[PDB]
């Protein structure tokens, strides 16, 4: 049994990046996979997303240049558990043959490194249509994986919120297996606190606030850094 | 040798009722222990079950033997009881937590029956007077607290040693509240009940002593 989980923050960032782009957009899903004993349950959590021009991954051919794909993702390959495809001006949530091809290629390439089976490599199909008077904006999406029987079956998505998350007894069971081999940014913060119940929960939240507040200028820096580099590359392309 | 009537002791009746009122969410269960004489099944003790199931019957049959030698009387598992909130063997069903929306009146039903091979019919029940609360019955309803605590400690055991700090804090928070919830609802009122029972007995005892003293004159 399979379940895809994602936070409001991560999901908002995905939709934020999609409505930004001039036209259609694709990229990769970063996250982990957890196993729970009950049969066994599989939770594939989506931590972050990253955009990528498909042309930068193609030879010349519609085949993914495996050399160019490694150079872009680099050391973040062990986190890629899926890819997404965004299309404007369509209410049609449809897998194209081209999309099926990209899924199979991306599955084979990442399955060895990400610590996950090729079975549950994710594909997220998003779209954005607008009304005649553009007074109503509709946003649709779905998660897919390639079945062992050759099927692209939809997976249940759970957006973890304050009312209901995927860890619902009120206890949080210890996962038997995790495909993550990357240090968590938040757990590193708690380790820095050098802790030795309620009082501990207060400090973590307070420390997270100061940490979160210090990240804000760093986020803005990296944003304008890429934004300028996005312009220079584009300016050169038009130049020629 | 044919079951004709069921006699339930009042102090055992109290234990079953107390167990039924422990929660209005789930159906609780237990095993009726006693003797079967001339068509009369007399229940003088009871065993609280942790929640048909087996193996527990073996622990009950062994306890029944421990009850035989102590009480100097034939003791065997005569059957079981179960609660029903918001709606060959002897069965008791304590229907509880049923109140009127406007009348503010609460109802409690107690049905007695004989069960065998999934079949059952009504059986005449009489609640027989007891001059006190049995030592075994006192210990029985104290075990309810111990069993509830034991259930919670088992659940937290499976989630113990969680790598994520936030999860460990969450689990210890859940265990803390749940233990407190048991103490406040089950353990503490039972403590108060016993204490008040003793004090109010001596109040009646001193009252009867004054009555007994002047009646002779």
Author numbering:
A (entry chain D): 5 to 42, 54 to 75, 77 to 184, 188 to 215, 221 to 264
B (entry chain A): 4 to 54, 64 to 99, 120 to 249
Question: Please, what does the article write about this entry?
Answer:
Optimization of the CfKIAA0157 construct boundaries by deletion of poorly conserved C-terminal residues 290 to 471 (CfKIAA0157ΔC) yielded crystals in complex with full length CfBRCC36 (residues 1-253) that diffracted to 2.55 Å resolution. Following manual rebuilding and refinement, two highly interdigitated CfBRCC36–KIAA0157ΔC heterodimers were apparent in the asymmetric unit, arranged in the suspected super dimer configuration. The structure of each protomer of CfBRCC36 and CfKIAA0157 consisted of a canonical MPN domain (residues 1–165 in BRCC36 comprising an eight strand β-sheet flanked by three α-helices and residues 1–180 in KIAA0157 comprising a seven strand β-sheet flanked by three α-helices), followed by two non-canonical helices α4 and α5 within the predicted coiled coil regions. The MPN domains of each associated in a pseudo two-fold manner centered on helices α1, resulting in a unified β-sheet and “fused” MPN+–MPN− superstructure (buried SA = 2902 Å2). Non-canonical helices α4 and α5 of CfBRCC36 interacted with helices α4 and α5 of CfKIAA0157 in the form of a coiled coil helical bundle (CCHB). The helical bundle was tethered against the fused MPN domains of BRCC36 and KIAA0157 via a mixture of hydrophobic and hydrophilic interactions.
